[PDB]
RNA sequence: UCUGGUGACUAUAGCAAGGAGGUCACACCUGUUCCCAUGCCGAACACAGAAGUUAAGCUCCUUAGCGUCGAUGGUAGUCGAACUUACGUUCCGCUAGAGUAGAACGUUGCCAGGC
RNA sequence: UUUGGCACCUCGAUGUCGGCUCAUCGCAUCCUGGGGCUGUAGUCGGUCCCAAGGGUUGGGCUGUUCGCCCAUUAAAGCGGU
RNA sequence: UGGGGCGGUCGCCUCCUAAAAGGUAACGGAGGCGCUCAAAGGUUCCCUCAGAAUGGUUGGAAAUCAUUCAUAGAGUGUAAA
RNA sequence: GAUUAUUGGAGGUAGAGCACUGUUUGGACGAGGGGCCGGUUACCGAAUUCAGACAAACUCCGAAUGCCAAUUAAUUUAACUUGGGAGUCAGAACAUGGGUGAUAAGGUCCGUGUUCGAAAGGGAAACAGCCCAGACCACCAGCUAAGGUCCCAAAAUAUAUGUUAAGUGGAAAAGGAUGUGGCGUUGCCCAGACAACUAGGAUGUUGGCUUAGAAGCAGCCAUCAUUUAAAGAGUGCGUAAUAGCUCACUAGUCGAGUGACACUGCGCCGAAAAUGUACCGGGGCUAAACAUAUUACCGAAGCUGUGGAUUGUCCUUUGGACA
């Protein structure tokens, strides 16, 4: 359910997924974030999803922010049909990430309770991940 | 089925001599909408803004201000 | 507060940069008022253990060759992928 | 001042830039070789085809 | 040989702030008779003046305050090669953008008066 | 083991669905369970091993691979073949 | 014409795909044209930005009016560059 | 005509990265509809001060490409021009470079490659879709190019040195455990590292809301002195409650090792599917897997032995002298 309000363009190329993130990649607004560790499309389902379980566990609790946002529509065929006869219609939206790149932060609780709340929301990406601190030195 | 096949027949434009070529007294030296590059010495502006020679002599592309183009002509030989 | 160093010298490549790294070492630079630009190499632990001492704003009397230089980190590039230091500025305060 | 470069891998496969650069070379089959006196200029040839020659001073 | 006209250079040359100033200059200033003029208006343009004035413009001197410039080093990326087509790796060339230190309150041509 | 692509032979022809007859490569198994472990009292449920070792029905109803009832039985896959 | 049919199409202009020049395909992604203009042409010349706040009879809060910052963010007959 | 170095431009190239912007996002701030009496507030909208995304339909830069100049060097005697004669337009197919579109396509562009068809071949099981070839052309030259080296079947039984252990070889995958170790670690203890040993297990204290009492446990602690070298308004196992032993502690015994990194290269379920095994072709093997070398040389349209072609340049000897 994060999706644009408008685009200018419905039907865009698709991100190009080598390389690594070109930024946000430093925990800067709680304690605690979950830092990916390869590269795949995140589709906002399942940012939502990683988002209501790892809520529920805090209890209201903390605070928790979301650094990535779908930008861009995909689009697929909606039956298996013919090759071309141009671009099908809007699916569903995605962000890419990279490794590097922070996914969600927490603050406002424990550490333990913090790890195990990014433990839960990491079993629903399609990622590998890590948890991790704020940088200091 | 869609509305997407059209497009327009491009047109050849950018540079048609070098800097530092030597060209006759009449030649195009860019073809260009607008003026990406503006006329120096010698050099005379189409009104289809090509940029063309006025005499023959060395082409030398230059700067105008902090950030414009231009392109002159010199008569040396 | 008391770092050593190596200078490293002419143009190091992009493969003994990366095998300097798989040691523990660091390249560095030292510039400011007293000295030219000096290319020199630390060693990453006793960085890490000066600086956990010293604080991330502090000074260091680290030594070029003969000479000490009190001195301050200017910024730092940092490998957040594997966090390590990859790259540091010293700027000589005086 | 001399330069002994003899052509070892062959040009079956390679790029057509980098086959121009054998035969600007003076090179013909494999396993021949020519003499050429030393200029930055034949260095530059030397360095766009180096997988493919061998090259020593005499 | 200080200004002032007038040219050349990518704002390193600009904005802002603070302080000084004046008939060889320079402007505000005073007016509408006349040339001329405002889709109304001597505001502007134009003309005739020269009582006032350094306040403002302008000049000169201080600031790095905002803009502008900006290395060294180290990274992205990439030509070629070798592994292998791993969301790659390795070797060798070219080295960015950003950001740091730092620059910078302009040099220079011609002319005439003042000298 | 319905779609995509073809086109990668076959317009100088590779016989299409059911059914019968005969199998069997030969496999995530209905029965026996042969065994066994548990959020298994026997009776179940569920899982594991084992198995294609051996077994795996006669009828009423159709247009055909689809189905649906009657009456049994220890019981009524998987289709490339 | 990712068999053919049905549907959708013949030309021109502008972007994007398009990878230092230029060129570049698809039933790939977006838009226009099939004119207009007696000044919206020429020319000496002349003369020469909105918006934003600000605060005002009007006040759509803003129409016109006034001060200062405002990039051609305004404006440019017509789509985009 | 060319082909290959330095110097100059053009594109504002893209890859990257954000130079106003245009759009899209999670920052944090007082005013306006408004909640109300024309405002008091909330939420909104808009405005000013952190961090992201496109910049396929963007702005500040610039690998390689391309255009060109040299009164500038190695290469090709070919160039461009005119004329005669064509084939080809499924021209494709495997190959990216980058990209579109269903990321199969054994479908669409494009920048080089390989065959190419006539270049056949020869060492990529054998394959006009890696190493090698263009051709004088043969021929018992014998010696090279590599892709190479039990049996096949040129060619290291091929060793030597120090690290490997799936038939990986000769099949990748999401989580879960203990893997060769390993240094870069980091930080744990003769008052004896993890020891395990077993000897202390409490208490006014559930004190409180006391919740089906609950006195480790409806769930909120109010989470206070201890006994002792040592122990919790009891780590905890539990528990309808107790039964609570230790994992909260140390003198009896007492030795050499411990927790987090990062992973780093290489191990442990997938590998459940059917005429026919199984990918060096493959049987057979641990070399016939990592890192180093190391001489061996094999080896073919490569050198050097023989030879009946022709072309070019030279002399002009028209020899085939060299090519």
Same mark, same amino acid.
Not at chain 1, 127 to 137: Q, Y
Not at chain 2, 42 to 61: E, H, Q, Y
Not at chain 3, 71 to 90: G, R, S
Not at chain 4, 14 to 37: D, I, M
């Given at each position: 359910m $994060? $999706?644009?309000?408008?685009?200018? %363009?419905?039907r865009q190329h698709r991100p190009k997924t080598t390389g690594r993130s070109k930024?946000?990649? %430093?925990?800067?607004?709680?304690?605690?974030?979950?830092?990916?560790?390869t590269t795949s499309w995140i589709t906002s389902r399942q940012?939502?999803?990683?988002?209501?379980?790892?809520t529920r566990y805090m209890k209201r609790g903390g605070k928790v922010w979301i650094k990535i946002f779908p930008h861009t529509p995909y689009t697929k065929k909606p039956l298996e049909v013919r090759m071309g006869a141009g671009k099908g219609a809007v699916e569903g939206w995605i962000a890419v990430v990279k490794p590097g790149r922070i996914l969600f932060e927490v603050a406002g609780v424990?550490?333990?309770?913090?790890?195990?709340? $990014?433990? $839960?929301?990491?079993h629903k990406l399609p990622?590998?991940?890590?948890?991790?601190?704020?940088?200091?030195? | 089925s869609t509305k997407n096949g059209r497009d327009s027949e491009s047109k050849r434009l950018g540079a048609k001599r070098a800097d530092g070529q030597f060209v006759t007294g009449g030649s195009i030296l860019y073809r260009?909408?607008?003026?990406?590059?503006?006329?120096?010495?010698?050099?005379?502006?189409?009104?289809? @803004?090509?940029?063309?020679?006025?005499? @023959?002599?060395?082409?030398?592309?230059?700067?105008?201000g902090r950030d414009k183009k231009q392109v002159s002509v010199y008569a040396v030989a | 507060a008391s770092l050593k160093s190596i200078i490293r010298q002419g143009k190091q490549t992009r493969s003994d940069l990366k095998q300097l790294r798989k040691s523990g070492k660091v390249p560095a630079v030292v510039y400011g008022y007293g000295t030219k630009n000096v290319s020199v190499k630390v060693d990453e632990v006793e960085f890490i253990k000066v600086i956990r001492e010293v604080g991330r704003?502090?000074?260091?009397?680290?030594?070029?060759?003969?000479?000490?230089?009190?001195?301050?980190?200017?910024?730092?590039?940092?490998?957040?992928?594997?966090?390590?230091?990859?790259?540091?500025?010293?700027?000589?305060?005086? | 001042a001399k330069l002994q470069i003899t052509l070892?891998?062959?040009?079956? /496969?390679?790029?057509?830039?980098?086959? &121009?650069?054998?035969?600007?070379? /003076?090179? &013909?089959?494999?396993?021949?070789?020519?003499?050429?006196?030393?200029?930055?200029?034949?260095? /530059?040839?030397?360095?766009?085809? &180096?997988?493919?020659?061998?090259?020593?001073?005499?």
């Open positions: $994060l $999706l644009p309000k408008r685009v200018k %363009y419905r930024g946000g990649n %430093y925990v800067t607004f709680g304690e605690f974030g979950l830092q990916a560790t940012i939502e999803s990683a988002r209501i379980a790892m424990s550490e333990e309770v913090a790890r195990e709340a $990014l433990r $839960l929301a990491s990622v590998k991940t890590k948890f991790v601190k704020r940088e200091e030195l | 260009q909408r607008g003026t990406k590059i503006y006329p120096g010495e010698n050099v005379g502006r189409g009104g289809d @803004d090509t940029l063309f020679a006025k005499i @023959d002599g060395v082409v030398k592309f230059e700067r105008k | 704003n502090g000074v260091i009397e680290l030594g070029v060759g003969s000479k000490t230089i009190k001195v301050m980190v200017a910024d730092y590039q940092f490998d957040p992928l594997k966090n390590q230091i990859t790259h540091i500025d010293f700027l000589a305060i005086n | 070892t891998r062959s040009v079956i /496969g390679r790029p057509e830039t980098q086959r &121009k650069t054998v035969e600007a070379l /003076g090179l &013909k089959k494999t396993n021949s070789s020519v003499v050429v006196e030393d200029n930055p200029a034949i260095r /530059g040839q030397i360095n766009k085809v &180096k997988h493919l020659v061998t090259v020593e001073e005499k």
